[PDB]
Design a protein around this nucleic acid. Structure first.
Ligand SMILES: [Mg+2]
Ligand SMILES: [Mg+2]
Ligand SMILES: [Mg+2]
Ligand SMILES: [Mg+2]
Ligand SMILES: [Mg+2]
Ligand SMILES: [Mg+2]
Ligand SMILES: [Mg+2]
Ligand SMILES: [Mg+2]
Ligand SMILES: [Mg+2]
Ligand SMILES: [Mg+2]
Lengths: 126, 185, 141, 57
RNA sequence: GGGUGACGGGGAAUCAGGGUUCGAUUCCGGAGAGGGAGCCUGAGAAACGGCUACCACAUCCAAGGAAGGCAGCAGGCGCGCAAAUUACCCACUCCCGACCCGGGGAGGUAGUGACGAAAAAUAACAAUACAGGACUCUUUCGAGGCCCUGUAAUUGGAAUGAGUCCACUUUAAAUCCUUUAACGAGGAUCCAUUGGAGGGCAAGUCUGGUGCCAGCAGCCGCGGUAAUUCCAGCUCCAAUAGCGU
């Protein structure tokens, strides 16, 4: 009700398949309104659902009655899982990632330098 | 390699003859007038001033009509007018060198928070600014030193969410109302 | 007089280059000697070991004893009579104990009433005397 | 010659005392205020052959 | 020829004008990968996270043999006056590859961090008791208060962040700031230091102890029984999240 959301420097990216712009959220008295709540506002504004909307990078000002951050609104989920960062899909978990945790991968790959050919042992390793 | 700037300077210069006495007197008188915090705060202004005075010297050694002076000078003056130090009409460069500390303190926030009633003594003013009580234009200025443009001055006042300027009352009054409601009443 | 002419530079320059080595300070920086001669091999301080506590009798008009410490350095293996500053401070220092020593304000020159004492003691067993003398810290045991 | 004996002779035997309990002294700016006030605005009296800030007859 | 506490430069610190000093170090160039030599591959190497030698160091050996190179990032020992984590991640910048897809201690991200630099709290206001002085009034004494300054009573509530902390935001995932609810100050407290107080040089001929001792003192000096110079107490002064050496 008392939030308000304005837009800025709006672009219609035919070639990244997206409406991308700066969101500028006046929001005095409250506590940097959450990203879910920004996307549901954007949907009513742009008449285009929340799933294709991806929002990020909100910085809140000193004092506090203004935040500012980038968001874009894809043409479809088809596209929004194509010309889109993986981490940001995983922000609303639709393209999560594996939990190997780097170091374990590096130490496996540093073995197998040891062994030649053994498809099953090379698969094994660790 | 990295990113990282490294670009940074000091803001002041410490005086060579370090107990001139007369110097001390004038410097404290300045700390008293304009509620300053420290000997540095005077010195950092005194260092800004100088820089301007230096530049203005350098421009005067050039010939007139020479594009460098005409350009910079104008800007340097236009800058000094914008902060409400130099006066329109008094814009012509030689008049800069005739200038002083006191004038560059006069256009602090604190000094303009005291002057523009609001406060109630230069000390009080300084506290408020810090406490997140006063706002310039729209942003809450936290910082005493905020030099206030001549443009900006008429838009200085309290913040819209802060006791003095029509806001939810602070936690001290808020406690005593709870004491009067539950405890006394 | 001067050389003064226009194509003199060299003659002028070289002359001053020569005369710099009659400037006592310049010579100190640019001959080796001094750097070699200091036990602190051009260092602000040096650690060392206190191989005895030594009674230094003060220079004439100011009659006293000074209480110093015969240090032997780590880096060089040279020796020193480091002054122990402050009152009762000598007693903090025990034999075979790891002093950090500094210069004494005078960059080679000896100081005040002490005779031929270039150095003052700063820390003992990684503690700092000031601290001990104040009573902030205590000697480890 | 001369012993390394007496060493801490004086500092030892002096008459030790506590350091009282006065007040939290004002700091930072407030200190500076108070200083400024007592040089320039409070006293400003009729002179009587020069001053003294820690003088005591 | 010798020396160099010599990688060169852009630059850095100082500065009136001239200078002096510094530049291992984030860009450019160069050099080298324990030392010296040789060479294969390849467009490009006389590559060292390639070989082959010797030397120097080191490691297992069933004693016949075999393997090694942190002046990458972490880390350790050693050296010293002297210097950070065996952390997270390819999200950014870029690079490499057959490659929109993999990889990167390059690179970023935290952690350590009083190298240094920027902002900046540690209180502010009131009426009181008072203590003083430009005005008005009064011969002086006293009074009317626009003006005001110090000490108190914390007398009075008001304001607040430090802090604790739900929640967003941040972000690769986090932290940090930022925004933000809820708690969160009477100074016994949420306690500001470091140096000095004979001169240079701001500031005690104060008060105790010492007696040419201990000690201070960059220099001039102080100390030999009234020490403005020591050790202490009190006050004072300078700079102040800093100040000494
Ligand atoms: Mg060399
Ligand atoms: Mg090479
Ligand atoms: Mg090595
Ligand atoms: Mg090679
Ligand atoms: Mg290597
Ligand atoms: Mg260090
Ligand atoms: Mg790296
Ligand atoms: Mg700082
Ligand atoms: Mg404090
Ligand atoms: Mg002095």
């Amino acid at each position: 009700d008392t939030v308000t959301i304005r837009t800025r420097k709006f672009m219609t990216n035919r070639l990244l398949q997206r409406k991308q712009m700066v969101i500028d959220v006046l929001h005095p008295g409250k506590a940097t309104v959450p990203k879910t709540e920004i996307r549901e506002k954007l949907a009513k504004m742009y008449k285009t659902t929340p799933d294709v909307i991806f929002v990020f990078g909100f910085r809140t000002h000193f004092g506090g009655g203004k935040t500012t951050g980038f968001g874009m609104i894809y043409d479809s989920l088809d596209y929004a899982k194509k010309n889109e960062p993986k981490h940001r899909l995983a922000r609303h978990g639709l393209y999560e990632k594996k939990k190997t945790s780097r170091k374990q991968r590096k130490e496996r790959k540093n073995r197998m330098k040891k062994v030649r050919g053994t498809a099953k042992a090379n698969v094994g390793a660790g | 390699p990295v990113a990282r700037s490294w670009v940074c300077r000091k803001t002041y210069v410490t005086p060579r003859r370090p107990f001139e006495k007369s110097r001390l007197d004038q410097e404290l008188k300045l700390i008293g007038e304009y509620g300053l915090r420290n000997k540095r705060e005077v010195w950092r202004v005194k260092f800004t001033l100088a820089k301007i005075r230096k530049a203005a010297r350098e421009l005067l050694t050039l010939d007139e009509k020479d594009p460098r002076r005409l350009f910079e000078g104008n800007a340097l003056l236009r800058r000094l007018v914008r902060i409400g130090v130099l006066d329109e009409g008094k814009m012509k460069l030689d008049y800069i060198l005739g200038l002083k500390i006191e004038d560059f303190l006069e256009r602090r926030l604190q000094t303009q928070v005291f002057k523009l009633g609001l406060a109630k003594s230069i000390h009080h003013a300084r506290v408020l600014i810090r406490q997140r009580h006063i706002r310039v234009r729209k942003q809450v200025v936290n910082i005493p030193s905020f030099i206030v443009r001549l443009d900006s001055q008429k838009h200085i006042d309290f913040s819209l969410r802060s006791p003095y300027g029509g806001g939810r009352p602070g936690r001290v009054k808020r406690k005593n109302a709870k004491k009067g409601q539950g405890g006394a009443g | 007089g001067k050389c003064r002419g226009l194509r003199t530079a060299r003659k002028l320059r070289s002359h001053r280059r020569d005369q710099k080595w009659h400037d006592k300070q310049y010579k100190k920086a640019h001959l080796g000697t001094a750097l070699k001669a200091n036990p602190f091999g051009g260092a602000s301080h040096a650690k060392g070991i206190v191989l005895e506590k030594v009674g230094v009798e003060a220079k004439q008009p100011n009659s006293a004893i000074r209480k110093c410490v015969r240090v032997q350095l780590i880096k060089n293996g040279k020796k020193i009579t480091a002054f122990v500053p402050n009152d009762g401070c000598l007693n903090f220092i025990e034999e075979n104990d790891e002093v950090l020593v500094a210069g004494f304000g005078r960059k080679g020159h000896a100081v005040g009433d002490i005779p031929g004492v270039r150095f003052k003691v700063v820390k003992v067993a990684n503690v700092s005397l000031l601290a001990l003398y104040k009573g902030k810290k205590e000697r480890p045991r | 010659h001369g012993s390394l004996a007496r060493v801490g002779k004086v500092r030892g035997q002096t008459l030790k005392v506590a350091k009282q309990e006065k007040k939290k002294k004002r700091t930072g700016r407030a200190k500076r205020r108070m200083q400024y006030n007592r040089r320039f605005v409070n006293v400003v009296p009729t002179f009587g052959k020069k001053k003294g800030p820690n003088a005591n007859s």
